[PDB]
Write a protein that binds this ligand. Structure first.
Ligand code: NA
Length: 185
């Protein structure tokens, strides 16, 4: 409706794009009119910009419908994906999950967001369990502290503590590709 309606995660229809408010601030400069600064992220492209607004100016929002979805596979071109409730099978851009698509497994439960029935983007869980394809031998005398590169079953690489071995199943933070913990048998 207006700038007063601004909060983080709110998505605007603006100059032909759909842009999420990542950060906003109402500003009273103490000389002249108030205005708003918004850090905006194109939800599709991921490109972020800084924009300013005349305080109280009309804005137009998009309702984003979030659907619980299962990732099936990569057909060489698209991510193939099934809507959990409807069981409908459709294509997503390989980019639709950002850098975190790095960590998609077959049959991973994900969320996809829509405006007027068109997929905008997908999200993995914050934590996912991925197996180690390869890392250097485990060192239990912590003897090499620090971390070593590990290659996950997806081909994604992360830093892991020295005690990790090939075949270990790790918990991984998808927000920044960081080691969380080792899953036990
Ligand atoms: Na992939």
């Amino acid at each position: 409706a207006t700038t007063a309606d601004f909060k983080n995660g709110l998505v605007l229809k603006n100059e032909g794009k759909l842009q999420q408010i990542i950060e906003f601030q109402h500003v009273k400069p103490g000389k002249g009119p108030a205005f708003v600064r918004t850090k905006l992220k194109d939800v599709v492209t991921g490109k972020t910009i800084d924009k300013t607004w005349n305080a109280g100016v009309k804005v137009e929002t998009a309702t984003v419908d979030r659907r619980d979805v299962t990732y099936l596979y990569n057909d060489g071109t698209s991510f193939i994906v099934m809507d959990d409730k409807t069981f409908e099978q459709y294509e997503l851009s390989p980019d639709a999950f950002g850098d975190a698509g790095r960590f998609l497994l077959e049959n991973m439960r994900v969320q996809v967001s829509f405006h007027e029935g068109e997929a905008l983007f997908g999200e993995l869980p914050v934590s996912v369990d991925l197996r180690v394809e390869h890392t250097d031998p485990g060192l239990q005398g912590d003897r090499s502290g620090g971390t070593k590169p590990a290659t996950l079953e997806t081909g994604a690489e992360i830093q892991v503590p020295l005690f990790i071995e090939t075949g270990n199943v790790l918990k991984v933070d998808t927000r920044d590709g960081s080691y969380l913990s080792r899953v036990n048998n």
